[PDB]
Amino acid sequence: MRGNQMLPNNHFNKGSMKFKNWFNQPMRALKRKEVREQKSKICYPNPLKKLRPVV
Amino acid sequence: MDIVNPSLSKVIDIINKGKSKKQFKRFQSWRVKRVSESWRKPRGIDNRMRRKFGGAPDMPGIGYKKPNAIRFLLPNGYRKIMVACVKDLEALISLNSFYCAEIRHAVGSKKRIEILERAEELGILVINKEGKLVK
Amino acid sequence: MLKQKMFEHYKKKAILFDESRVPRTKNVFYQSLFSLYKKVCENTENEIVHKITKRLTMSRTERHPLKLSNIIEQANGKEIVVFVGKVLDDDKILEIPKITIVALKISKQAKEKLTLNGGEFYTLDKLFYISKDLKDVALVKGDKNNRKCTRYFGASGDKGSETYPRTRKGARRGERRIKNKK
Amino acid sequence: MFNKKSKSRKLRGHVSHGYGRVGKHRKHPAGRGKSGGLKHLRSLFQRYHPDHFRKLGIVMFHRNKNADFTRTVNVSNLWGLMKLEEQMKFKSSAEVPVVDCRNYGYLKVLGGGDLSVKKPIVVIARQFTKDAEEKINAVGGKCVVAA
Amino acid sequence: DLIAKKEQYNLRMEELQKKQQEQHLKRVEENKKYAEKRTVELLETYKKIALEQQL
Amino acid sequence: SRQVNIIEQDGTSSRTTSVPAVFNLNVRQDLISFTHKNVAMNSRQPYAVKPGAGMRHSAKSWGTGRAMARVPRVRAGGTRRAGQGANANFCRGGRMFAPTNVNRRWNRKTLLSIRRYASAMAVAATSIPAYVEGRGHRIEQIENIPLVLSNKIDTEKTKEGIKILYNLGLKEELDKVEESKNIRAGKGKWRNRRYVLKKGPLFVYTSETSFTKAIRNIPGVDTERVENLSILDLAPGGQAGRLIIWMEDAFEKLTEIYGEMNEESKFKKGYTMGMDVAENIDVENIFYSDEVQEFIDIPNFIKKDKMVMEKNKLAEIQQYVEIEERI
RNA sequence: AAAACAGUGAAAUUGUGUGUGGACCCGAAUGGAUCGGGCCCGUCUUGAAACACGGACCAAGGAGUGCACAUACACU
Fold first, then answer.
1. Neighbours of chain F (3+ CB pairs under 8 A)
2. How far apart are CA B49 and CA B57, in angstroms?
3. F68 FRET partner, CA 20 to 30 A, in B28, D109, F19, F130?
4. Cβ-based interface (< 8 Å): residues of D facing A
5. Which of F252, F202, F205, F201 is nearest to F226 (CA)?
6. CB-proximal positions of chain G, under 7 Å
7. Rounded-to-integer distance, Cα B35 and Cα B59, Å
8. Buried b (16+ CB within 10 A) or exposed e, F76-92
9. CA(F189)–C1'(G5) in Å?
10. Which family is it part of (chain F) (predicted)?
């Protein structure tokens, strides 16, 4: 270690650590859209969401 | 082919006889077959060529570069341009005083005939004129 | 006699444009403007023109910005002011004197304020129309030393040093300045 | 520039990759992490980080950020919270503006500079400095404390 | 309009170039005549200075 | 500014329209290129080698004293594989240096304000003949730019659709695309990228119409909506000035989308159309103005000759004569 | 473990024929004997031609990379 820096503190020591990637993000968005649409048919005239209070 | 640029006709032989024939072979390419002839600079701690002892060969460098006017000039006194279409010759129409054309190797016989016919009427020198089309 | 002649020559050569410098931007509108000034320099000795041409070649960080009130503070009673940089609004001020600014760029909120109070913004291509003999102009400059990152330059473990340590920071955590004077 | 070639590509053909022939490039010649700081690295610490090896201050085992979070404004900036079109109305008009700092997320008022326009103003906040109060009262304005 | 004004500059400068050139040759010719007379003077004053020492 | 003529099915023109304000904006080939580079990287799929390839076998070093290099070697018997060199990157069947890995950063960010500005000045370039010709679209036969097709196009069949496009002068452009089809050079021809074609006209619509499915099978025709017009379609390969067929509704919408000069767009919140540091590329010509020519000073054209020191040449510049005096 | 097309068919290495030399390189030449200069590379080292170590020969493979966190510079 040489020169002037903010002293390190990077937590990568643990060999059992898992990584999570997000390559599925656009596809899972499309599935959530298609589930709402079909749910909306099952109860056609009624809104999909209920009324809620203000706090 | 025996042709010359008219602007240099009385000078071309002085120019040609003045060009160097030096080669810069890689060090020890004469000793083992696994080292090719292509130049690489020696970087050893002990190396006799890097240290420039008398009796070792010479190294490339800027001093050997030719005058700016003579450089790139073919032995007929022209510079060269590559062509592969009829529409390429159209570029040379202003430059034919100093430049000549060389048809690319992959252009086939039937097409070459069409290039040469156009070259004749525009007045452009083609240096591969005989080419494959001798038969 | 000779010693004076020599020094007066050095002082001059220290002002004039170098002519082996060029701006690094690939912006063709910026490179157009530099070409004009360059062709003016080789036909004049006037110090304002030489100063302007040298500043167009400096980096984004060297062209540090100024706020409207600081221009007025440095204008020192002149009518026209010139600035190779961007002019920003000062939220602390509303009324200003009537003034003409020739500069590289201006922010939306600054331009409105300048206009409401009476006054004009012109780009640096127009300088020669705004002024006839460059006697009524002031030239103004920012300072890159005022960046917040300059507080960390140097060593905090020197005696009497005013510099700040690079540190983690929280409600309790953080390294202090301990070798300064108060 | 937006793109540039790297240094590694120029070092092809040069033996040591720029680490030296005598010194070389070994695995960890000085130790791992920020260790050694009271020993062989004492000179780095005493030059750049002198307040590292210490314990300091009062301790609360749990703290809440929301209960202590605040943001501060100076008197010279009060008129600046209004939009520029709004500023230019109240400057000429006979009416007095009523500015509430809570609406812009400010809770404390400080005494820096002079007021932009020397006409009355009503300022609502949670706390005022002694200098701020005197300056606002000087122009015939009023300070109103509120939650 | 400026493309037309560019021509007036080129014309004006050619006149100025021819003018300055003519003024230069006259200086060069003037200088040659002064130089002839002066060299005859100085070669004689050396001769005088030498006799002063012999005396 | 100008009016522009609308074109009906039969090629007649009668009604006319003003031109949107976006078309007066100057063009920055630096920013168009930068934006193209970043956005083009957002469509990639990840690739990597298998997570422990090259490391399967039971291997150990033999250590010194055996007259062999101390590489790990394969433990086996009965096969020629016994004693061969195992795990390292310099070994046949070993593990590669720094195996490629899924955690790499595939996409790239670009500020929303730059994306908006780049698309605005790409749209502008679609109406300068120099740029359109420069991309290689051929427009010798086209009467005027831009083209605006009317509504009340009642076309449903490709047969009648082509007849319309021919009447606008596009024949040579379309032919240039059809004749272009060729098989790609290199390994890409194995990986589902077999044929390459030249780019042609883009059609831009805003309102749903039958004309869209009448023109689409013609090679090199491309279609997009005005409200979601992309820089990949407007500046292919990062060079600007694609030829565009506007629909009459779409052309009027450009005023709502980009607004007016020194105003704020209602459709794009927080965005306004700005000013360059100089108005034109021609500003070098200001030198010849009256105001400048009064300011400067008269040049000196007379210049000194280079120093010469050769015996004979020097003797004609300085004729030396001896003297007898001894003073 | 090895082993694709009954394609193309490099180098190391071998036989036959024709030429030029007696380890070979650089500079300069003859009809013709040759003249002058040159110790074996890579590497640690105050110091290598070394009685310091690695290298029989040819092809193909073969070593500053990716992510996180602060940072200075250039560009928007």
1. A, C, E
2. 7
3. B28
4. 30, 33-34, 41, 44, 48-49, 52
5. F205
6. 1-2, 11-13, 24-27, 37-39, 41-46, 48-49, 57-59, 61-76
7. 17
8. eeeeeeeebbbbeeebe
9. 20
10. Belongs to the universal ribosomal protein uL4 family.
